[PDB]
Amino acid sequence: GHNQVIHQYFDEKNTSGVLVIQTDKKINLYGNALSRANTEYVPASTFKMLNALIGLENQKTDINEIFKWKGEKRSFTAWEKDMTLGEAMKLSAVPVYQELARRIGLDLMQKEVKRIGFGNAEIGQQVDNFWLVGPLKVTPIQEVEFVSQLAHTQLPFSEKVQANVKNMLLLEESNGYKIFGKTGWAMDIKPQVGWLTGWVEQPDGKIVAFALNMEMRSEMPASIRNELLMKSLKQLNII
Ligand SMILES: *[C@H](O)[C@H](CO)[C@H]1C[C@H](S[C@H]2CN[C@@H](C(=O)N(C)C)C2)C(C(=O)O)=N1
């Protein structure tokens, strides 16, 4: 696990990103801009994990509720359907999670976020966008421990709610290993910030949490987050 090779991957994908790895409370940093680890960025779709948790915990929804698309034009055609909270998570389908947020309401959301202690724990006044254009901001270090805690079922929520949310996050299950995570991409701010926060379940049950953060750019493909992360984790011999 050479901190040089990984620098060269971020070097050569022309970006500015850091990869945070936490393995039972030791945090290692990789990339080409390690200073990113301690600066706050808007969380974007990575805040859906926390949004589900709050919603499920407060019984504003459940994993079987179907969210009806009422016909407004949305940003992707894949989002123009009825779907479950879990389907909306796989697609990062913002409008669904804005509905949920509006159900929670400002007060509940503000109390929950500051109770969890997530990022700056500031959501301002508009309860269905604070995680896309501020004011809510979080460092990649805080994100990896948040997701580390979730993987270990150690967040301040009931266990069944955390398990419900973990099951929406399954990204890939190959050769004995399991990968969980949530992509993010804040497109409507400068600079654009892209995320991929989650964890690896090693076949023996060891948990390795991770939080990819990079500066984003409109012409980049979606998979540049997965390509960067996959070959970084294979390098570190986490897979
Ligand atoms: C906010 O919309 C943001 C969450 O950070 C979205 C934008 C990108 S792109 C997203 C659109 N739908 C997914 C997909 O591949 N399709 C077309 C179903 C991907 C994003 C992300 O994936 O990080 N989340």
Numbering used by the authors: 35 to 273
Task: Copy text from the publication.
The acylation of OXA-23 following addition of MA-1-206 was monitored at seven time points. Our time-dependent studies showed substantial density for the pyrroline ring, the sulfur atom, part of the pyrrolidine tail of MA-1-206, and the acyl bond with the catalytic serine (Ser79) from the earliest time point (t = 30 s) onwards. Much weaker density (only observable at low σ values) for the 6α-hydroxymethyl side group was seen for up to 2 min of observation, indicating that while a substantial amount of the acyl-enzyme OXA-23-MA-1-206 complex accumulates early in the reaction, the 6α-hydroxymethyl side group of MA-1-206 remains mobile for most molecules for at least the first 2 min. Refinement of the 30 s ≤ t ≤ 2 min complexes shows that at these early time points, the hydroxyl group adopts an orientation pointing away from Ser79 and Lys82CO2. At the earliest time point, there is a small density lobe in the residual Fo-Fc map, suggesting that some MA-1-206 molecules may still be present as the Δ2 tautomer. At the three shortest time points (30 s ≤ t ≤ 2 min), the average MA-1-206 occupancy was less than unity but was still well occupied (approximately 80%), as expected based upon the strength of the residual Fo-Fc density. In contrast, at the early time points (30 s ≤ t ≤ 2 min), occupancy of the O62 hydroxyl atom was much lower (35 to 55%); however, it increased to 100% at the longer time points. At time points 30 s ≤ t ≤ 2 min, both the Val128 and Leu166 side chains were in “closed” conformations, whereas at time points 3 min ≤ t ≤ 25 min, the Val128 side chain transitioned to the “open” conformation during refinement.
Among them, the OXA-23-like carbapenemases are most widespread and have been detected in up to 83% of A. baumannii clinical isolates.
